[PDB]
Nucleic acid binder design. Structure first.
Ligand SMILES: [Mg+2]
Ligand SMILES: [Zn+2]
Ligand SMILES: [Zn+2]
Ligand SMILES: [Zn+2]
Ligand SMILES: [Zn+2]
Ligand SMILES: [Zn+2]
Ligand SMILES: [Zn+2]
Lengths: 103, 103
DNA sequence: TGTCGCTGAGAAGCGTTTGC
DNA sequence: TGTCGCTGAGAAGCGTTTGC
């Protein structure tokens, strides 16, 4: 059931993907088929989300929506998508989601 | 992929299952279809194996073969199968398998 | 510009495997 | 009477969800 984690190279990141980053939480488009889930807000939407570059990372915990990364971690998805060494907050051990800050 | 954990009641344990407990490791029958895996020796065989009674337990880590439970933990599968309150060594946190004693 | 609860999740088994 | 290495594993998303 675990969705495979695939590292998208920074040179392979499209400007269409960059412009499809969500800016306002309430303006999201839910899609049970093509959408992706943000680890923080746990909403499966079509807006572009971050991609963890840690080889040992797995699953969906590296995917964060636009609003979530800039409000819970003070970082921009556009910078994380083009960051060669970006690790998700779970990898950094700084995730403050409902689950992570309890466990 | 996780095999569901089902608690077999002690009153529902068959004498045929009891007599099918493995006694010698080298006299095991491998079966990729009907066999079960022992958490300790990691062999999928048809010999009767233990069943953890912990409700929060999951997966295969509660299944131990005859030789493994009596050689690594000094306990008998026949006693564990009829024990109302038996928890597997992983639940007791005393598992000494190759993986558990490292992590 | 905004978030958590809840279910169900939380591997398993072949291969290179058997104590001195 | 006997055991470990190795791959691949290690959730995800709807519902009861949006900061004052
Ligand atoms: Mg799974
Ligand atoms: Zn989010
Ligand atoms: Zn990560
Ligand atoms: Zn988290
Ligand atoms: Zn065994
Ligand atoms: Zn158990
Ligand atoms: Zn173990």
């Amino acid at each position: 059931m675990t969705l495979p984690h695939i590292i998208r190279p920074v040179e392979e990141v499209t400007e269409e993907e960059i412009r499809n980053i969500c800016s306002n939480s309430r303006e999201k488009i839910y899609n049970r088929s093509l959408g992706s889930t943000c680890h923080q807000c746990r909403q499966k939407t079509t807006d572009t989300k971050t991609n963890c570059r840690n080889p040992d990372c797995w699953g969906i915990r590296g995917q964060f929506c636009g609003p979530c990364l800039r409000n819970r971690y003070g970082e921009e998805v556009k910078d994380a998508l083009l960051d060669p060494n970006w690790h998700c907050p779970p990898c950094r051990g700084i995730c403050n989601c409902s689950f992570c800050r309890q466990r």
